[PDB]
Amino acid sequence: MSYNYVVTAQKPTAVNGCVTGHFTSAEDLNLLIAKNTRLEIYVVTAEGLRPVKEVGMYGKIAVMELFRPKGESKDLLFILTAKYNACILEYKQSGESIDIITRAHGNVQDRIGRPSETGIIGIIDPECRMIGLRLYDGLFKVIPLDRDNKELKAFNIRLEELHVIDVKFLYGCQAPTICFVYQDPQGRHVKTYEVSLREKEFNKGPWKQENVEAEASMVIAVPEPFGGAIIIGQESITYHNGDKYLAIAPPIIKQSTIVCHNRVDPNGSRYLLGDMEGRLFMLLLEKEEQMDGTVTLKDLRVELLGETSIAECLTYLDNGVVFVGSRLGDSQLVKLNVDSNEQGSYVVAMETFTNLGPIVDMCVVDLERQGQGQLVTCSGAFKEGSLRIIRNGIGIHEHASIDLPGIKGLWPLRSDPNRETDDTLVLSFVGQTRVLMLNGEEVEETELMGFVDDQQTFFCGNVAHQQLIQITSASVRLVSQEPKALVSEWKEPQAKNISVASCNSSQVVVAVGRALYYLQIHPQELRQISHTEMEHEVACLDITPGLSPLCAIGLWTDISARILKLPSFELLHKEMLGGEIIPRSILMTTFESSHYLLCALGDGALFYFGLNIETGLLSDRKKVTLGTQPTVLRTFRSLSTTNVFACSDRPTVIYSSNHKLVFSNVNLKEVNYMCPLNSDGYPDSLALANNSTLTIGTIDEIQKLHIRTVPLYESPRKICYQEVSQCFGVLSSRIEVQDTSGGTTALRPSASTQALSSSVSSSKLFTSFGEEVEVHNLLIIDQHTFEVLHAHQFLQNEYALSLVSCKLGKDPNTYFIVGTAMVYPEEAEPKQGRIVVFQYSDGKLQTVAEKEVKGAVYSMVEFNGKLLASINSTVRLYEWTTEKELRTECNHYNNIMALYLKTKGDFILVGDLMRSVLLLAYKPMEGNFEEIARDFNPNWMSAVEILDDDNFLGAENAFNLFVCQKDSAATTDEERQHLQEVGLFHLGEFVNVFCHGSLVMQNLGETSTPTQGSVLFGTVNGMIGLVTSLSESWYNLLLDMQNRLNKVIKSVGKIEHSFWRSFHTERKTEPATGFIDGDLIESFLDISRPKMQEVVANLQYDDGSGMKREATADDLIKVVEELTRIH
Amino acid sequence: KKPNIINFDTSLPTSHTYLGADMEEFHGRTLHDDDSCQVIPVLPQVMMILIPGQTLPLQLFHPQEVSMVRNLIQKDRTFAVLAYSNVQEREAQFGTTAEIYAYREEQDFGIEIVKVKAIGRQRFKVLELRTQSDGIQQAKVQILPECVLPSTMSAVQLESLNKCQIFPSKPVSREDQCSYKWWQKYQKRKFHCANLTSWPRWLYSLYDAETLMDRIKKQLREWDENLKDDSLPSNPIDFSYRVAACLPIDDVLRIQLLKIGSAIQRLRCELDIMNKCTSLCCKQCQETEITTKNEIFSLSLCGPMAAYVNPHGYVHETLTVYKACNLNLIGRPSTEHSWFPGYAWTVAQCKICASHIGWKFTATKKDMSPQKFWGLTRSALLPT
């Protein structure tokens, strides 16, 4: 009884693996990057990375490798899923179609066995004879590689050493040889085995066990001709080849441990290394020894190249370019030049790819445009900590700017031989018309020979029959094309002022006062076509198609929209367009291959209507609030077919996708007037003129997602937004080394040490040299410039957990409430905390209140003007007294630590890390808490959210989502006190934070939406989700359509959707219930016509009376398109 | 307070030599499929919460019970013990299955008295208690599953820093400055992914099996001198069960610990209980001090507390103490059926109500703890 719909609004960005090789073709060099469920195939070129293919796989890529067996032209890709869905894939392209064919597929899990503590290890024999997987302790799984092994049958081998740290295949062995480091109570040892496929067991290794360093961490296999293995630990780098043995103890690597590597030479002469703090090392192997043709090591000099992002997976691209794959920072593309050496660093950055993960906390705030939300996250960690500001809209990439003091209309003109190019544009000033002709990048003004100078021109375009028509306020004028001289001047019969002018390719309609005149363009002649009159003044007129069947006219004195036959005088149709104000601009467009009448009134409302091209007009009534200013509708050709730009205080681009007009905002403050300008210098551009300056630039394809970075150089923990102060309060932490002077020196310039004003907490309510100590800060950041306006430093040994910005009690002021806990290394459970209430005013931060609590304030919320706190395992309620001091009101003692607190009305949801969901209600007539229900189940819970008063969403172990509801209508107490669980889903992501909101325009739309509510969640990988509620019939229809989609869509690796989405746990797995996979439903639009015909045969689409068993195909389009607008 | 010389060879009490020497044993263990519904006979005349892994001596005299044991051994070797609540008369909803491993049937006194020792194996919740006319009711039992949780960092783990998740062995053993400094870096390196989540590292250390087991071991070693890995298992399930068995707590708290299905929750509850428990008092009095939290040690591998049988078949859970308070002795120290091979028990009584709180075990030979061994049972013993 939940019927939820979950979709991904932003695909994950964190990278957890990258390989290079000849994947698409034997000659091309590709970079395959796995972010989580997505596999991206790029092509490495001299300029950089050219994306080629994006593929979504039904799983999380835990292991990916490129191998080329014998008799193959290009490398194949072997991918293992965290659910043990092993597969082998092949790239296949035929001219324009890109498809990845699955060479083999199969689940390789075991019925019984504990997964290894070190994790999944997947290795391939360099001779391409076997695939070795270490999934379970004491069991080595081997998959033979033969063309007939299309089901991936694997056999297990018993391993006597249970704890294997790292294992890899050696190079240069006649038989498949593995080399690994294992742990014993006697210490750490390196051992080798000779795996034999024929008898399916191990053998004696080429070289016996050798004792290694106590912290031997990683094993790298040196290829031919050197052979052997290199063992890297915390304080030494060793090379082992049997008789050969060497070790080094360089001091530059003692600071941090190496966690990643990547070979840079085919012969393994040099190696690339990276550590935890993110600095590039260069292991150097010397081949100076050559006795009788044998090549052996001589030295292992280690050189530090520079500092980069915190890198998880290095990969050296061609010609001194390294792709630094970061997961907690930002992916980079840097240069390893050996001649720059600007200050001792060998590395300079080229590129930087966006990476929103990890998303520790987020908030939804209306920063710029009222009604549309914006996402502000706390991304990154350590030196990569930063604030990402996400927004939804079409991004106009600026190309040039010029100065114009409030232009009142722009129009390109053609005064050149026919070449389908734009040479000059006339800008209508306040009283004049300054033709700013610019063949290239000019800015001067060159008046047209056939156009007036100071007449406030209404329209100026290129008419048919080789002429340019420039209708001005006084009278409509024309200019010849080749002669370029005024040949015809269509003076008004009454010589009045042209109020509203409408011009077309070959017909011009001019409104003088309340009268309308129609004229037809003739070669070197202005022959009037018809004359007529109107009862009311013509507020707006527009004629669009050679010959317009009808002309749309607005009434100034009646506030109604009519369509009348241009070759005649009798109106074809009419309607009352609201009547609130006079219409501002009405246009006819064919955006969706139909006849649409977009009329915009002066109040900012578009009274959208549907008309008929042949005769008459339909109604198709629609009203959309496009802004608060009279928009100037102007279709710009730099689009799919026509598009429309409603230039107003809230600019929007009106484009038809699936016969349903989307209205996406633009990244501009306000546009006074816009016009296409396809200049030769800037083809397919668009000139938009604002209230101060006029810019020229292009636009994005459709409805992108834009991210703005604010680096802080320290880890941000929590973020809250304060409306009245126009500020963001963010908690942060920096690592400071413990020097031998009693102080704490920092490591790099952080945001807290670069603030305008700084403060240090001073309260009195209560080591080793080199140790790293956390220093916690509260940063106040302006919402416009995103500069750190303030930074408050807490006491020593104080850890700040929570942060709420809210107003308490009857106090008009809004405060920052922070809950901290004094933590010491000696003790495990904190015994004392602190509730501190700050108030940011006049750019100065002051401590309004300060309470001492005995425990750790794990979370706080705002409960109807009362601060609700969670001290250890107790939930307490605090009342804001008139003297600005928190006073306790009620307590409720639990047996679980209240890590999570969510309120909706008077329903408190209390959660912990043991998935022990608890529910509470606050009786206000009595003033004490009382428990309604309870649902305990041993598992790990990451986050929890209140979907509504009846259902609750949570994130569980193994990247799962669950939905629990209480049956308040149950007649038995035991059922009322228990929360029935009626939803399961395998998301594949670790959700940290849940928040209510949406990133699309909030429009009631009278009929509303098929989805109720909206919840966004952010994950560690940096993926933004969106979950909504659905109706019963809608859920049933979507489930049936999903089942039929499963049989038509061919997934990569042939992983079944039900198995992938099945609720997964180390102990017990169940099929998914109560959740609809929005990705699969939205994938319905990307398949061809016959596939969509196959999907729908008997869905019984209609539910509002009747069944309509045919169900058509475009009805599902009208369904999926309405489901796509929610994100 | 007798340190250093603890010479007892603390393994004989775990063998129960008082219950006969040539006791026939059985080869091994048995398995019951999880979440499966079984019929298991229930031997009466036992009222005690048996935590899994705890040995239970038993003497049976009545012909019905002896026959039940005989035909039980010829078909499986499993019976059921119900964890009776505070209310008597079969007011039980949870229980455990004891496994026979030592058996002998004996003919003296003209009876077929049977001596049997059995240890708990699984945990169950009884569905219905159907009574058989023979006298040995069989209970309709559902096997309660054992839940083991993976590392809290496994979900949010960084793929790169997996290889640094295999920590080296602890330095030396039970030595200062080799634990605090080791534990600090262990916490720093294990929970390094806690920055990806929204919680600090110490919060995740509060839910770590290793850290809680270390804290419990430290506090136990504070109580009595443990011999490092003195039979204390590395498996969190087994360690939790052993600690719950050896804790000096009452019946309701034992039932609460039994209800818990995860090791980590059990360890947290055990830590809370033995941090909040300092004294043990006389149940018939609730006013007299007999023991404390620090004057507690172990001459048995099962810890300070273990189950023994008097020659009349009644089962007593006994706690060993250096020095008791507010106790009086009656009768000469005799050693006819002493559970401890070398001591002569003297019955101990409350000095106020004269309730059987336990026994005083005077020594016999001189090269052992000189008459300082209080074996107080749980008949009248509650936390205070």
Ligand SMILES: N#Cc1ccc(N2CCN(Cc3ccc(COc4cccc5c4CN([C@H]4CCC(=O)NC4=O)C5=O)cc3)CC2)c(F)c1
């Ligand atoms: N139906 C039937 C039926 C048939 C036969 C029965 N037989 C009757 C005769 N019994 C022999 C006998 C009786 C009496 C004693 C004295 O010892 C006693 C007495 C009472 C309580 C306790 C002890 C010792 N003791 C603890 C002290 C601490 C320690 O270390 N160990 C202990 O044992 C006690 O708590 C010794 C032997 C044998 C049984 C029968 F009783 C029922």
Ligand SMILES: [Zn+2]
């Ligand atoms: Zn007493």
